[PDB]
């Protein structure tokens, strides 16, 4: 290659770019939620998926997955969303989380209790 041009314009390569740019370098963000619904999965997986539509304060509007068994969500119910891809959903690169606001407690489990925070018994 012409080195007498590399001294003016170097070699350039493709840069890495986010699959979740709407969060803008935050680990989770708040949305009011405009719609809570279900959608049929990608490929022959035959398992109905739970999703919500979220518009963000920065002008983005995206779709999020409702992880953890059991929920109470509606329009204007207010939720937290984070990163993490779902491969069997159309365009769903976001996860909805329930450590904050008004989302109901997850269905209880005896293992892996960090998953959507399985809450300990208390009297």
């Amino acid at each position: 290659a012409t080195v007498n041009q590399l001294v003016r314009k170097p070699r350039a390569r493709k840069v890495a770019k986010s699959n979740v740019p709407a969060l803008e370098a935050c680990p989770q963000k708040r949305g009011v939620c405009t719609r809570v619904y279900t959608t049929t999965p990608k490929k022959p997986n035959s398992a109905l998926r739970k999703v919500c539509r979220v518009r963000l304060t920065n002008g983005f509007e995206v779709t999020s997955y409702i992880g953890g068994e059991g929920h109470n969500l509606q329009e204007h119910s207010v939720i937290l969303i984070r990163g993490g891809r779902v491969k069997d959903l159309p365009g769903v690169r976001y996860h909805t989380v329930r450590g904050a606001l008004d989302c109901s407690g997850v269905k209880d489990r005896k293992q892996a209790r960090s998953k959507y925070g399985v809450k300990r018994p208390k009297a």
Partner: protein
């Protein structure tokens, strides 16, 4: 010792000054390729024995006006 350069006149359109071009003529530090790298200075001269295309020798001295610090010594090729 003081700093002195050889270069050439590229404009003589003003009376008591000449626009002089100087070069680096050196390798690029990460490519080894020669780079000419021209820079222009607005050099003082009230003698008027030189003009455009003349090869000229200049010296570093004190500022005389805004952004101007270099002055003429001699004509190097003496083509006229």
């Amino acid at each position: 010792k003081i700093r002195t350069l050889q270069g050439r006149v590229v404009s003589d359109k003003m009376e008591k000054s000449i626009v002089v071009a100087i070069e680096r003529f050196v390798k690029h530090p990460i490519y080894g390729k020669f780079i000419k790298r021209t820079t222009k200075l607005h050099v003082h001269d009230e003698n008027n024995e030189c003009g455009i295309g003349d090869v000229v020798e200049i010296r570093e001295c004190r500022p005389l006006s805004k952004t101007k610090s270099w002055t003429l010594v001699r004509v190097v090729e003496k083509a006229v």
